[PDB]
Amino acid sequence: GKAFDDGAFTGIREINLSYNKETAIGDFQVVYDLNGSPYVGQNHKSFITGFTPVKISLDFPSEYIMEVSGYTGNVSGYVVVRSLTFKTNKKTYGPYGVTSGTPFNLPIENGLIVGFKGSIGYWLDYFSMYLSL
Amino acid sequence: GKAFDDGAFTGIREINLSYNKETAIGDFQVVYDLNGSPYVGQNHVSFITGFTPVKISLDFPSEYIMEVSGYTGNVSGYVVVRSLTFKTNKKTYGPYGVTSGTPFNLPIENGLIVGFKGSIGYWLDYFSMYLSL
Amino acid sequence: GKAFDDGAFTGIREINLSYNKETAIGDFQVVYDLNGSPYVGQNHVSFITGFTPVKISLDFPSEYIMEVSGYTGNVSGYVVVRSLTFKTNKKTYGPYGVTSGTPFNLPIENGLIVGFKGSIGYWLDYFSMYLSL
C-alpha cells in the first residue's frame, strides 16, 4: 500500500480511524500537539470504502495513551492490522475491528507515543510508533 | 520585554535576526524543520526599528550549528544579549552586534539545537535553547 | 515473586537465563556495558531448580538486540513468561521455553534495550525493558 510517516510531535490530541467488522482497519489520521498547538496530520485513507469511522478525542495533556494493543492477521491474502485498542490513564478505547489472529501489545511504564508511521492499501498493512520522554 | 517560546522541532533550516552595530540584537525568527518540512516560527520583533537584518540559510540537513556564542551586557540600563555568533560544521556566521560585556558560549559535542525561547523588548533580553539527539 | 530492577546502562554484553521447556523461564541475569566496561548485573534466581542454563554472549558493540518476542501464559494458576526469543542484527537466540500461549513481540526500528526489571518467583512473572537512543 501507500506508505506514510507523520514524524514526531509533542503529544497526541485526537485519533481518527475507521474499521470494518469483517476485515480490518482502514483509515488512520492523528491530530498531534506541536508545542501547545493542535497540528492536524495528513489523513491516511484506505483505497476502498465501507468502513465505520471512530473518533478518539483525548483530554490533552492530562490524558495520554499508556498501552496500544491489537491483532494482525490475514485478510484476502494480506497480513494486516485487523484491530486496535488504545488504553489511556482515563479509559479504554476499543477494541475496534476484528479481534482475531495474532495479538500484540505495547504497554508503556514511562514515556509517551509522539508519532506514527506505517502503510495503508485496502487496509492498514503495518505501523510503528515514535516514543519519547 | 515580551516573552516567547517556539518549542522544540526536528532541526533548524534558517535564522533571521537583526542587530545594531552600537546596541544589541533586535528581531529574532527561526525557520525550523518539522519532520522534513520547513516550519516558519513566529517572528519575534523588537519594539523599535533601525536594525540591520541578517539571514542565515543553512544547508540542512548536512549543515548544523555546532556552537553558539555571544556577549551579554548593559544597554541603556538593561542587561541584554549584545552579540551572537553561530558556528556550523561548515562556516562561522557573525559576530553580529557588539562584542562587549560578558561572553558566553555553548559548544555541542553530540546533539542538536532544536528550539529557542526568550524575551524581546527593545532588544533580546535573554534566551535559552532546546537540545536533543 | 521477588521484584528486581537493574536500572539503565550503556548497552548489553551478555544475557544468562535458565528455562524449562515444559514450564517457563526461571533465572535471569544480565552483563551490561557501563561506558565501555562490563558491569555484572545481579543474578535474579528462581526459588526452585531443574532449569536448563543458557548463555547469550553478544559481540558487543557491533551486535545488538533488534527484537524481543515470547509467550505468556499459565503454569498452574500463575500467569508467567513461558518463552523468550532474542533476535540481534547477527543471529536469533531461542526460542527458549514453551512456545504456546499469548504471544508478544517488541521490534525496535531505532533505539536500544539498556536495562531490565521484573519479578521472579518460581518463574519469571513479568518483565519490562528500558529503551534509549
Binding site: 491489537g70 492498514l124 510508533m129 | - | 533505539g111
Partner: peptide, 16 residues
C-alpha cells in the same frame, strides 16, 4: 551526524 533529530521507534507490527 546529520542535522535531523532522532527518537526511539518501535515496530512495525503487521506485514513484514
Amino acid at each position: 551526524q546529520s542535522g535531523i533529530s532522532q527518537t526511539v521507534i518501535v515496530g512495525p507490527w503487521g506485514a513484514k
